[PDB]
Design a protein around this ligand. Structure first.
Ligand code: NA
Ligand code: NA
Length: 327
DNA sequence: CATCTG
DNA sequence: CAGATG
């Protein structure tokens, strides 16, 4: 956790690079287990060979651990940190809509910057365009104080359109968090579930309303159950308009809301633990359900949940207020 | 995983 | 349809 930190960090730099710049998924994947293992490892790696000793740790990585331990730096790390081509990719990629794949094409075309991008708005698709238009707003965190305002709107409009809707803002926002990156509203309706054959309107109706009042400003992606967009808190009395924020709305069958809700609320670590406890308690859990573990090996059949309560109970556990869902 | 592009 | 992105 700090005893093999540099090592783990270098490895991660290396890993990421393989993947984003080269196309070295193997290699890339290679740095990863290595960091994962040395990461677990209980002592102070004092040398290459010592590390080599681990699994996932081979000759090459050892070599590197050597140089790093031997001197505060890595040549290769140093070479990549410079190289423009590499730096560009780390950069273009910052744009919502640009993954590595795209980042490579652009660079090989010479677009290596924001301006480049602008000059070539023609080569970018809808998503990417919005992403470019809001580069700035997109990187700005969302102060909870804003979140509450947003949340107030979404919730009210959903209400108007149908009393039967059930919306919830998952995220860290949910677990307390003073600010967040984006807004995800989990959504369900009684008239929508596991069997129930579809109801696209269910999601389209609300999205619409949201734009009707102007909360939503752009559409990144709109499918039958998942909407990806852009919203904004109405600029009060002209002098201070808000940044544009990322937002997601997802339809969930009412019969798998809470697991979902639970799930998305996190944290990752809270999940896992609750996840492992479940198991002990003779249970299975995932994104949509909680199942009674048979003994033959495994086994299923969806336990019936009405709240986040029904779940905990199941695995017989202390109901956790969202704030305490930390670890 | 669900969406989009081409 | 494979393949990218989030
Ligand atoms: Na991106
Ligand atoms: Na292939």
């Amino acid at each position: 956790e700090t005893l093999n930190g540099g090592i783990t960090d270098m490895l991660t730099e290396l890993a990421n690079f393989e993947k984003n710049v080269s196309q070295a998924i193997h290699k890339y994947n290679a740095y990863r287990k290595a960091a994962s293992v040395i990461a677990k490892y209980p002592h102070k790696i004092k040398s290459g060979a010592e590390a080599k000793k681990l699994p996932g740790v081979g000759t090459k990585i050892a070599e590197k651990i050597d140089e790093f331990l031997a001197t505060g730096k890595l040549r290769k790390l140093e070479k990549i940190r410079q190289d423009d081509t590499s730096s560009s990719i780390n950069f273009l990629t910052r744009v919502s809509g640009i993954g590595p794949s795209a980042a490579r094409k652009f660079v090989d075309e010479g677009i290596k910057t924001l301006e480049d991008l602008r000059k070539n708005e023609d080569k970018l698709n809808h998503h990417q365009r919005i992403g470019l238009k809001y580069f700035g707003d997109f990187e700005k965190r969302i102060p909870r104080e804003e979140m509450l305002q947003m949340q107030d709107i979404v919730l009210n409009e959903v209400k108007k359109v149908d009393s039967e809707y059930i919306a919830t803002v998952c995220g860290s926002f949910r677990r307390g968090a003073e600010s967040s990156g984006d807004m995800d509203v989990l959504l369900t309706h009684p008239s929508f579930t596991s069997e129930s054959t579809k109801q696209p309107k269910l999601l389209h109706q609300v999205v619409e309303q949201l734009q009707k009042v102007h909360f939503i400003t752009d559409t990144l992606s709109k499918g039958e159950t998942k909407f990806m967009g852009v919203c904004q808190l109405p600029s009060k009395n002209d002098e201070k308009e808000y940044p544009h924020r990322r937002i997601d709305i997802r339809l969930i069958p009412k019969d798998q809301y809470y697991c979902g809700v639970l799930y998305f609320t996190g944290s990752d670590i809270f999940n896992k633990n609750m996840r492992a406890h479940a198991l002990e308690k003779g249970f299975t859990i995932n994104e949509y359900t909680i199942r009674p573990l048979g003994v033959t090996g495994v086994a299923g059949e969806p336990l019936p949940v009405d709240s986040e309560k029904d779940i905990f109970d199941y695995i017989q556990w202390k109901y956790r207020e969202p704030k305490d869902r930390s670890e």
